[PDB]
Amino acid sequence: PQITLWQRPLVTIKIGGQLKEALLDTGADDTVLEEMSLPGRWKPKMIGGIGGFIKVRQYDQILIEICGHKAIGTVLVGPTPVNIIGRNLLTQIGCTLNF
Amino acid sequence: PQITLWQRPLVTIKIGGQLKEALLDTGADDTVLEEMSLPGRWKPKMIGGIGGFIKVRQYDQILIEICGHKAIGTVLVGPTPVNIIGRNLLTQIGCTLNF
Ligand SMILES: COC(=O)N[C@H](C(=O)NN(Cc1ccc(Br)cc1)C(=O)CC[C@@](O)(Cc1ccccc1)C(=O)N[C@H]1c2ccccc2C[C@H]1O)C(C)(C)C
């Protein structure tokens, strides 16, 4: 589909059997979601944006569905103000910027 | 043009007669540039990102060219990690997300 930017590009995602709302974020290197449980091993990571850095848990090879499009990648979990779908997963669903 | 996201979507912008590198950021509601000089008066604005909120200076009706496309709008100036082109200007150049 084509998503305009008149409003925040929020979409429905399916992860860990749960339905959530997330932001298609081209300014984000990684994907980070609010506190939730995920399977497998994880390691700590610090990510930074405007305001500074926050500590998150890094889980790899996680299955995620964005608007019905399946993709697998690293998903970060921590105190993020909003769910963010970053470039690491946006590439997988073939998302591009156009103008 | 069409921009993929395998690498950060960095483009050249022109403001105040100078070229700068900036990130097309769909996750950003506003445009915020690293410390620089802009004309006119400014107003205070608090913007929140991953690490919390920061105080920035808000200048309005500023001429800024993005990838050759001319825009005129609000530009914030403050301690940002990188120059960020947000949705307020991405809408002016007709940018959309597609997949
Ligand atoms: C490794 O560095 C990253 O890529 N870090 C990401 C990040 O923070 N990216 N930042 C900016 C940034 C920092 C460093 C670099 Br090299 C590039 C880019 C954003 O602007 C987008 C997030 C976001 O859209 C998230 C968000 C938080 C709260 C509500 C909505 C969305 C952001 O902080 N957006 C805000 C913003 C940025 C600039 C101007 C105005 C605003 C208001 C929000 O939209 C992340 C992995 C931690 C998510």
Name every residue whose Cβ is closer than 8 Å to that of residue A4 and which is 6 or more positions away in sequence.
Answer: B91, B96
Residue A31: both structure tokens together: 């994907």
- Please say whether the beta carbons of B80 and A48 come within 8 A: no
Taking an 8 Å cut-off on Cβ atoms, the answer to whether B80 and A50 are in contact is yes
Please state, in angstroms and rounded to a whole number, the distance separating the CA atoms of residues A23 and A90. Answer: 11
The Cα angle at residue B13 between residues B12 and B19, in degrees rounded to 5: 85
Please state, in angstroms and rounded to a whole number, the distance separating the CA atoms of residues B40 and A1. Answer: 41
Please state, in angstroms and rounded to a whole number, the distance separating the CA atoms of residues A42 and A81. Answer: 21
B88: DSSP letter: H
Name the experimental technique. X-ray
Task: Calculate how close chain B gets to A37, using CA atoms only, in Å.
Answer: 20
* Longest CA span, chain B: 41
Neighbours of A56 (CB within 10 A): 22
Name every residue whose Cβ is closer than 8 Å to that of residue B33 and which is 6 or more positions away in sequence.
Answer: B15, B20, B22, B75, B76, B77, B80, B83, B84
Nearest-by-Cβ selection for A96 from B5, B80, B81: B5
> Cα dihedral sign for A96, B62, B33, B48?
negative
B89: DSSP letter: H
Mutant choice from A50, A54, A64 vs B, greatest count of B C-beta within 10 A? A50
| DSSP one-letter string for chain A | -EE-SSS--EEEEEETTEEEEEEE-TT-SS-EESS----S--EEEEEEETTEEEEEEEEEEEEEEETTEEEEEEEEES--SS-EE-HHHHTTTT-EEE-
Please state, in angstroms and rounded to a whole number, the distance separating the CA atoms of residues B21 and A25. Answer: 18
Resolution in A: 1.8
CA of B28 from ligand 1 middle (Å) equals 6
- Please say whether the beta carbons of A9 and A23 come within 8 A: yes
Taking an 8 Å cut-off on Cβ atoms, the answer to whether B98 and A3 are in contact is yes
Where do the domains of chain A lie?
Answer: 1-99
H-helix or E-strand spanning residue B23: strand B18-24
**Architecture of the domain defined by A1-99:** Beta Barrel (2.40)
Taking alpha carbons only, the member of A59, A61, A50, A6 closest to residue A28 is: A50
